[model samples]
Target chain A: QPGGGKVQIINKKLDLSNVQSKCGSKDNIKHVTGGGSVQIVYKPVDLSKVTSKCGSLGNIHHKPGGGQVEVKSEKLDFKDRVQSKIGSLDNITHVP
Target chain B: QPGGGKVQIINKKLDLSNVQSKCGSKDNIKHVTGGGSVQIVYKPVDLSKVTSKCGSLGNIHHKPGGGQVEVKSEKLDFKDRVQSKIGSLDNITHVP
Candidate 1:
C-alpha cells in the first residue's frame, strides 16, 4: 500500500508447472512452460481526482447557507488479491 | 476468464461495514461507510502482441539451414485476484 502517494510495484513469479496448467488450454502449452514472470504496477490514487458526493431520493431539506456536505474516501490495499493469479498473464513475460 | 478473447467486467460491492474499517485509518470513515462499489474491467490479451524468445549462453550449436525457432505465449486469468480488494479504491465509486 502506498498510502495514496507513490506507485507500488508487485513482482510475482510463476513456476513452469503453474504456467503450463493455465496455458494448457492451448496446444503449445509446453513451449510456454519453459518459464515466466508476472509484474503488476499499481498506480497511486489522486485524491483530487477521486470524486464522490451525497445524494438521495428521500425527503431532503437544506437551510440557506446551512447545508453541510461531507466527503470521505477510503484507500484499500489489493496486494493479496493482486498476487492471487500466479498463472494469469497481465503484463506478464515469458522466461523462455 | 475470457480465454484470450474479449474483455471481462468484474463487479464487486463493499458493505458499509467493510468500507468503514478500511477507511478507519482516516478521520472521515463515516462518510465513506455510506456504501460503495468497485468495478474491474479486465482487458483481453493480444496474442499477436505477446512476445517471447528462448536463448541461453550454454547453447552454441546450429546446423546450416536447420535452425528452428519456436515462440509460445500464455494467458492467465486474474478474476479472483481482481476482486479481492473490495475495500480499496481502484476505479471505485462512493455510494454516499
Candidate 2:
C-alpha cells in the first residue's frame, strides 16, 4: 500500500456581474424594464443536490436559506386528517 | 518595473448541503417541518454587485436571471404616473 495516498481536491466559482456583465469586457449594463412594477428576478439555481429537512411527519416549516428543508409527503391517518378538516381555516393561512 | 506582469484572480464558493450539512461530514440532513405547508427557502445571496436593468421610464419588467435586472427608482414625470392609473386594472394584474 502506498504509505500515504495524497488527497487532492480543488474547487472554484466564476461570477462576473461587473461592467462586463457577460460575453466579454466593459459591457455597460443597462435596463429594459419594458413596462411593469414590483420587479422580480427569477434566478436559476441547481437543486440536483438539495435535500429537504423541513420537519417531521404532520408538521412543516419553511427553512430560511436554500438546500436544508424537507417536506414529508406521507399520507395522514384518518384521525389526523379529519382533525385538520374540521379545525382548519380554508385558505386562511398566513402569507406565503 | 518588470517588463511584463501576469494578472490573476481566483474566485470560489463553498456550499456543502450533504451528509455533513455543516460543522462536519456524514451528518444526514434532516428537517423538522414542525407544522406547515407550501414550503419555502430563503437563501442569503450576495447582491453587492447587482445592477438595475429592468426597463426605461414608464416600462418595468422583471429579469429572469440573477444580477441582470435593474430597477429604476428615479422620480417619474406626471404623465408617466397616471397612465398606469388610468390603464392599469387598479390591482388586477396577474399572479405575482
Candidate 3:
C-alpha cells in the first residue's frame, strides 16, 4: 500500500488456444489472437477521505498525479463520448 | 513622433513613360514592366487620453509592447499580398 491506498501492479500473459470461441475474426485476431501482454498499476480509494462541496453530490477527488498509462495501441480508441461522432467516418485511421 | 502618435515615413519612386494610360494587361506588363521599389509608414490617432470601463466604456490605451512585420515577394496573388511570390515556376524541376 502506498499513500495509504492499495497499489497493485497487475501483469497478465494469457494463452489463446481456443481463439475462435472468444474473439472471432482474422482482422481482430491480428491484434489479440497471437496472445498479447499487459501491465497495470492500480490504486484503490474510498469515500470519507474528503469533504463534499456540493451537497447530495458525492464528494470525490482524484490524487493529483495519479494516472494510468495503458500500453496497448489497440486500447486507445476514441469513443463517441470523448468526441461527438456526429459527422464521423467509421474507419480505422481516423486518429487525431 | 513615437509614443504620442503622429509617425510618418512615406517614400516613392514612380515613372511610367508610356504604359497604356494607367494600367493594363500583357501579364500587367510582367510586374509594372519591371518596376523599382518604394517604402511607406503612416500613423495617426486622436482622442481623449483615457477613461471609464463597461456600462460607460471610454478609454484608449496602447503601448510599445509592439506589433508586426510584412514583406513582399510576388507583385500578384498570395505573393502580392505579402510580396513573396514564386517568380519563376516555368519549366522548373518539381523538387520537394
Candidate 4:
C-alpha cells in the first residue's frame, strides 16, 4: 500500500539583527540569527511492511545526511499536537 | 555541484456530489468534478551546466507524461509573481 507522509519544516534563527547596519538600514539588531532551515521531503514510501508498535501505526522518518528510522507508533493525541503547534510560534519558543 | 530543486503537488478531486447521495451532506450539487492530481518530485538536479538563453536564470520544468522541457530564461519580475500569488487563492481561481 502507498503510505502518506507529512513533513514539518523547521527554521532556526540566531538573530544577528543588531550585529551591524551594513548595507540596508540603520537598525539596532541585537541577536545574531544563525539558524538553518531543514526540510524532510518524502515520496512513495512503501507502507506494505507496516507493523503495529505500541498502540498505533508505524511510519518512517528520514533524517538529513541519509539516515532512516522507523518511528514508534503513538497517538499524536492532543498533547503532542499542542506542543508542536506552540513550537510554530516564533516569539514563545527559542531553539539554541 | 548538486543544485536545489522544488516540487509542487497538485491534487485533483472528483466531487460526485450530484451523482450520489451515498455519504454525507444532502444538497443540489451541479458539478461532477473529476480530475487527477499529480506530484512533481525532484531531487539533486544538476545545474552546473547552466547557460543563459533568453534573459534570466534557467530552471527546468518537468511534465508528468514522461515529457520534460527547459523553461526559457526570462525575468520573473513582479508581474509574474503577482499572477502566481493570486492563482494560489482557491476561491479566486478554479482548477478545473
True contacts kept of each: 0.02, 0.02, 0.00, 0.00
Per-residue accuracy of model 1 over B1-96 as CA lDDT, tens digit each: 111112233332222221121121222222122112222222322221211234212222221121122222234322223232222323222222
TM-score of chain B of each: 0.14, 0.16, 0.21, 0.13
lDDT by residue (tens digit), candidate 4, B1-96: 222222222221121212222333323333221221122333432222223333433233322222231222222211111011112211121111
As a whole number from 0 to 100, the lDDT of residue A45 in candidate 2 is 48
Predictions' DockQ, in order:
0.02, 0.02, 0.01, 0.01
- TM-score quality measure for candidate 3: 0.14
lDDT of 1 by residue, A1-96 (tens): 112122233333222221222121312112121112222222222222211234212222221121122223334232324232223223221221
Q: Give the TM-score of candidate 3 (chain A).
A: 0.18
TM-score, cand. 2: 0.14
RMSD of 3: 36.5
Residue ranges of candidate 4 with Cα displaced over 4 Å: A1-39, A42-66, A79-96, B1-96
lDDT by residue for model 2 over A2-71, one digit each (tens)? Answer: 1211221222321223221123223232332222213223433433221224332222232223232333
lDDT by residue for model 4 over A59-92, one digit each (tens)? 3432223224222222222111101122221111
In candidate 3, how many Å is residue A91 off?
Answer: 82
Pick by lDDT: which candidate is best? 2
Lowest lDDT block of 10, candidate 2 chain B = B81-90
